[PDB]
Amino acid sequence: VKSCKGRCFERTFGNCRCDAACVELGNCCLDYQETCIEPEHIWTCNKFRCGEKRLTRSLCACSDDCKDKGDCCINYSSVCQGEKSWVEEPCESINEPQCPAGFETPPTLLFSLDGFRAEYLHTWGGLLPVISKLKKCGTYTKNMRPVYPTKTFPNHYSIVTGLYPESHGIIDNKMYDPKMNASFSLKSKEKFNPEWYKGEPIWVTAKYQGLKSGTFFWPGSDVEINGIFPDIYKMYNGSVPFEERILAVLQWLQLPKDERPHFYTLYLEEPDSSGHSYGPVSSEVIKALQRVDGMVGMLMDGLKELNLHRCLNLILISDHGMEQGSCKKYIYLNKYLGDVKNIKVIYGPAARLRPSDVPDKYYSFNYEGIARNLSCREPNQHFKPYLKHFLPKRLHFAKSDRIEPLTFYLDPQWQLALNPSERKYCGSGFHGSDNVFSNMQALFVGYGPGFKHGIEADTFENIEVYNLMCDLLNLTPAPNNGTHGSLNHLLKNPVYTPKHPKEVHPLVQCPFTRNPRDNLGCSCNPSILPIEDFQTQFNLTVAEEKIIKHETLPYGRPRVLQKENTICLLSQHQFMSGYSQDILMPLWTSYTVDRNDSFSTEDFSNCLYQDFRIPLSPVHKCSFYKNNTKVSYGFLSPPQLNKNSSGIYSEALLTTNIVPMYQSFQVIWRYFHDTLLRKYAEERNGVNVVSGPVFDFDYDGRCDSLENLRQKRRVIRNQEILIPTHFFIVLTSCKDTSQTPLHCENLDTLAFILPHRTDNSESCVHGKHDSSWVEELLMLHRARITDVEHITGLSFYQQRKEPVSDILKLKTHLPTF
Ligand SMILES: *[C@@H]1O[C@H](CO)[C@@H](O[C@@H]2O[C@H](CO)[C@@H](O[C@@H]3O[C@H](CO)[C@@H](O)[C@H](O[C@@H]4O[C@H](CO)[C@@H](O)[C@H](O)[C@@H]4O)[C@@H]3O)[C@H](O)[C@H]2NC(C)=O)[C@H](O)[C@H]1NC(C)=O
Ligand SMILES: *[C@@H]1O[C@H](CO)[C@@H](O[C@@H]2O[C@H](CO)[C@@H](O[C@H]3O[C@H](CO)[C@@H](O)[C@H](O)[C@@H]3O)[C@H](O)[C@H]2NC(C)=O)[C@H](O)[C@H]1NC(C)=O
Ligand SMILES: *[C@@H]1O[C@H](CO)[C@@H](O[C@@H]2O[C@H](CO)[C@@H](O)[C@H](O)[C@H]2NC(C)=O)[C@H](O)[C@H]1NC(C)=O
Ligand SMILES: COc1ccc2c(Oc3ccc(NS(N)(=O)=O)cc3)ccnc2c1
Ligand SMILES: *[C@@H]1O[C@H](CO)[C@@H](O)[C@H](O)[C@H]1NC(C)=O
Ligand SMILES: *[C@@H]1O[C@H](CO)[C@@H](O)[C@H](O)[C@H]1NC(C)=O
Ligand SMILES: [Zn+2]
Ligand SMILES: [Zn+2]
C-alpha cells in the first residue's frame, strides 16, 4: 500500500498514487520516481527495481524474467543476485586466455578517454576504483608521452598508425594543404576527404591479414582510408550516450564468429570536455572522471557476463593531458607586429604562422623576417619563433608541407594568438604544448591475457602502441615510427624477437702511407708536443689495440647501416673514430672521460697535425680556416682531455678529428667540453662519449643519402665543403655510480641532437651568463638514442650482453628531469 512496486500507472483508491497526476497533487508513493520513471532514463538496477514488473519503456530490465529474455541491466547480477561486480573480485592472473571459438587469437579493444591526463590517476586514484583495479591487475605506466602537437586528432591517428603526425598527415584539428589548396576542419566535409589521412591505421592492417574491425568512434574510422572502412563503424555523433557505445561493442562481441571483429575501438569525449569548460582542477572534472570510471566498470561487468573478461585484451588510453589556461598567460603578436592583415596565426600553445595569400605566397613569403622581428623582444619571453626545421628533432614536426614554415614554441601554461578577437576564452583548460610537459602526459593501462599483471613500466611513447596491438593480434605491422620489440617487456609472450641491424659493407682499411710532412699554415702553441715519428706512435701491438678498444668502445663500435659508404677505423690512445673519405670527416668518435681526468685551459686554436693515414686535403689545413668568415672548425674528441699528461692531447689535433663548425656554435661546443663534460664525468663516476656530425637537409629526421649529400656541399675559398645541419652527443654511464662506464650492469644514457646555426638567436644570449643558456639549449634539444640512430644512420650498443628488446627499451628512452 506504501510502494508503487507492481502497480506503476494503475489507478488506486485510498493508497498513495503511482500515476503521472500524483506529482502535482503531492500524493505519490515515496518510491514512484525510482520504480516507474527512472527506468526510462538509466541503464542500472537498484534495490527499488529488483523484481520489478517489466515496464515497456525501460532501457533495460531488472524483472525476474530478464535473464531468460536476455535484457537485464549489466549490474543486475551484482545488485539483484548479490554476485560480485568485476571491480569487487580480487585480481587473478590470466596465463591461458579463456575464449570462444573464433578468438584463437583473442580480441583487442582500444578504449580512449579524451584529455585524461596521467596526473588525474596519480592524484584521484582513490575516487577511481575501476581504473585503479585495472592498474593493480594489469600493465601500467605513470606517463605515456603523446606526439606534438598534443591534440585530439593528431594523437588518436598516431596511436592507430604508429606514425608521427608529420608522416600521417593529421598535424592538427585544423590545417591548410597548399598542394590541395584546401583547409581541414572537424566541422567541415573535408574531414571525410581521404587525401588528409596517410599511413595505414591498424583496422586496415588487420583487414589485409583477415581480421574484421568494429569502431564505436575513433578519428579516421568514419573515413574511407586506402579504399577501406572498418567492418563496423559509426558516423561521429558526440550526443550518443557513453552507455549506448559500450552496450553496442558488447553486442558486436556476441556476433557469430564469421562476422565478429577482433579489433575494437571506444572513444569518450570526457574528461577533455569538462577539462576545457571548467579547468583540470574542478568539481566538473572530478565528476567526469568518476563517470568514465563507471563506464569502464560497465564494460568489465559486461565482458564478465559474456565470459570474455579473461579473453579480451583491453588497452585503456588517452590522446593527451590538460593544463589551466590564463588570460594573464596569453601572448598577442599584434603587440609586436601591429594589426596586420597579410598573416593568419593558428592560436594555442602549438601556434603556427602562414600568409593570408595562399597558395600563391606559401613558399615565397618572408617567414625569416617575422622570425627575427619576434626573437628576444623581452627578457624571460614566454614564446620563441622557430622555422620548423630548427625545432628540436624530438618533436618530429617539420617534414609535412601542412606544417607552416614558421612555428612558435610556448612555455608551460602559455598560449599565443594574433589578437584577443582570434581565440576562445583564455581562462579555459587547454592542451597542445610540448609533449614532455608533465600535464600533457597521457593514460595507458593494458589488461588481459596478452599483458603482464601488476607491472609499472617506465615512460614510453604512444607511437610504440601500433606495434604492440599488432603483436596482440598476430599481425605484421606496416612500416611505422615505433621500435618493434621496445615494448616486449609489457607482454607475457612476445611474438617478435628483434635483432640488432646488420651493417651493409665491411669496414674499409686506412693504412699508413709514407708522405712528406707538409706546412698546414698553423701557428701552434709552443706548449703542445708535436708528433715527431707518426709511423712509430701509430704502429700499435694487438695487445695495445685491445687495451684501447676496451677503454673507448666498451659497448662495441657504432655500426653503419647506410647503403653507399666507405668508413675506416682510426685508432688513437684516448679515442677511436669512423672516418668518411666520401665527406672528408669522421661520422663518429668514441672516448671515455674518467672521474679523475684533467681538462687543460691551454690554447689549441690554429694548430693541426697531419694524419698520414688519409690523403691530405685543402680543407684539413689551418690555412683554409685562417681568417675564414664563412666557417671555422671543431674537434669531435676533445684536445683539452689529457690522461697521461697535464698539457694538451696532441693525437686529438689530427686532421681526421675535425668537423666544419660555425664560430657561433663554437661557444656551445667549447662550454660543453671545458665545463659540462667534466661535471657529468664527476657526478656519474665516468662517462663514455660518442659525438659526430648530422646531415638532415630534408629535415625528415633521417640521414641524407651520399647521392643527396653531393648536391648539398658549399663552395668556400674555391673548395667544396659539407657543413653539418646538427651535431649529436651520446653520454653513457652506469645506473650504479659505484661502477665506471666500462663495467655497468645497467646503462644510464643521455643524448642530444644540437642544431648547427650561424647565430645563437635561439638562446637570446645578450646580458646573460654563458653558463646558463648552453645547458638550457642542450636540455631542449635532448633526444632518444633511436632519434640519433635514424638521423646519423648509425647503430649503438651492439656488443652488450643484454637481450635486443632490453637495448631497444634503452634506445627509445627520452630523459625527463
Ligand atoms: C616514420 O616512418 C615512416 C614510415 O616508415 C617513414 O616515412 C617514409 O619515408 C620514406 C623515405 O622518406 C618514404 O619512402 C619513399 O622513398 C623515395 C625516396 O627515393 C621517395 O621518393 C618516395 O616518394 C614517392 O615518390 C614517387 C614519385 O615518382 C612515387 O613513385 C612513390 O609512390 C612515392 O610517392 C617515397 O616517399 C615513405 O613514403 C615514408 N612513408 C610515410 C608513410 O611517410 C619516416 O621516415 C619515419 N620517420 C622517422 C623520423 O624515422
Ligand atoms: C545523434 O545521437 C543522438 C543521441 O542518440 C540522437 O538524438 C536522439 O534521437 C532520437 C531518435 O530516436 C530522439 O528521439 C525522438 O524520436 C523518437 C522516435 O519516434 C520519438 O520517441 C520522439 O519524437 C523523440 O523526441 C531523441 O530525443 C534524441 N536524443 C537526444 C538526447 O537528443 C540523434 O538523432 C543522433 N543522430 C544524429 C545524426 O544527430
Ligand atoms: C584556392 O583556394 C582559394 C580559397 O578557397 C580560392 O580563392 C577563391 O577564389 C574564388 C574565385 O573567384 C572566389 O570565390 C574567392 O576569391 C576565393 N574564395 C574564398 C572562399 O576565399 C582559389 O580560387 C583557389 N585556387 C587557387 C589555385 O588559388
Ligand atoms: C568517428 O570518428 C570520430 C571520432 C572522434 C571525433 C571527434 O572527437 C572530438 C569530439 C569533441 C571534441 N571537442 S570536446 N571533447 O571539447 O567537446 C574534440 C574531438 C571530433 C570530430 N570527429 C570525430 C570523428
Ligand atoms: C615588425 O614588423 C612590423 C610590421 O609587421 C613593424 O611595424 C615593426 O616595426 C617590426 N618590428 C621590428 C623590426 O622590431
Ligand atoms: C685573424 O686570425 C688571427 C689569429 O690567427 C686573429 O688574432 C685576428 O683577429 C684575425 N684577423 C682578422 C683580419 O680578423
Ligand atoms: Zn583530445
Ligand atoms: Zn581538447
PDB file of N, CA and C and ligand atoms in Angstrom, residues 336-337 340 373 377, ligand 5:
ATOM      1  N   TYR A 336      53.600  43.296 -31.231  1.00  0.00           N
ATOM      2  CA  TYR A 336      54.951  43.386 -31.845  1.00  0.00           C
ATOM      3  C   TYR A 336      54.870  43.701 -33.345  1.00  0.00           C
ATOM      4  N   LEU A 337      53.777  43.328 -34.016  1.00  0.00           N
ATOM      5  CA  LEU A 337      53.651  43.380 -35.498  1.00  0.00           C
ATOM      6  C   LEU A 337      52.662  44.471 -35.935  1.00  0.00           C
ATOM      7  N   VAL A 340      48.209  43.874 -38.533  1.00  0.00           N
ATOM      8  CA  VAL A 340      48.480  43.434 -39.939  1.00  0.00           C
ATOM      9  C   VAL A 340      47.394  42.436 -40.369  1.00  0.00           C
ATOM     10  N   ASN A 373      62.063  39.526 -36.297  1.00  0.00           N
ATOM     11  CA  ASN A 373      61.209  40.590 -35.702  1.00  0.00           C
ATOM     12  C   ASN A 373      60.749  40.145 -34.302  1.00  0.00           C
ATOM     13  N   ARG A 377      62.606  39.803 -27.909  1.00  0.00           N
ATOM     14  CA  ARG A 377      61.973  41.143 -27.822  1.00  0.00           C
ATOM     15  C   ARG A 377      61.715  41.515 -26.357  1.00  0.00           C
TER      16      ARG A 377
HETATM   17  C1  LIG B   5      57.958  44.109 -37.044  1.00  0.00           C
HETATM   18  O1  LIG B   5      57.135  44.216 -38.212  1.00  0.00           O
HETATM   19  C2  LIG B   5      56.099  45.198 -38.105  1.00  0.00           C
HETATM   20  C3  LIG B   5      55.174  45.082 -39.311  1.00  0.00           C
HETATM   21  O2  LIG B   5      54.546  43.796 -39.274  1.00  0.00           O
HETATM   22  C4  LIG B   5      56.738  46.574 -37.991  1.00  0.00           C
HETATM   23  O3  LIG B   5      55.720  47.577 -37.878  1.00  0.00           O
HETATM   24  C5  LIG B   5      57.662  46.583 -36.774  1.00  0.00           C
HETATM   25  O4  LIG B   5      58.367  47.820 -36.729  1.00  0.00           O
HETATM   26  C6  LIG B   5      58.673  45.443 -36.834  1.00  0.00           C
HETATM   27  N1  LIG B   5      59.445  45.400 -35.603  1.00  0.00           N
HETATM   28  C7  LIG B   5      60.773  45.240 -35.527  1.00  0.00           C
HETATM   29  C8  LIG B   5      61.575  45.195 -36.800  1.00  0.00           C
HETATM   30  O5  LIG B   5      61.311  45.100 -34.437  1.00  0.00           O
END
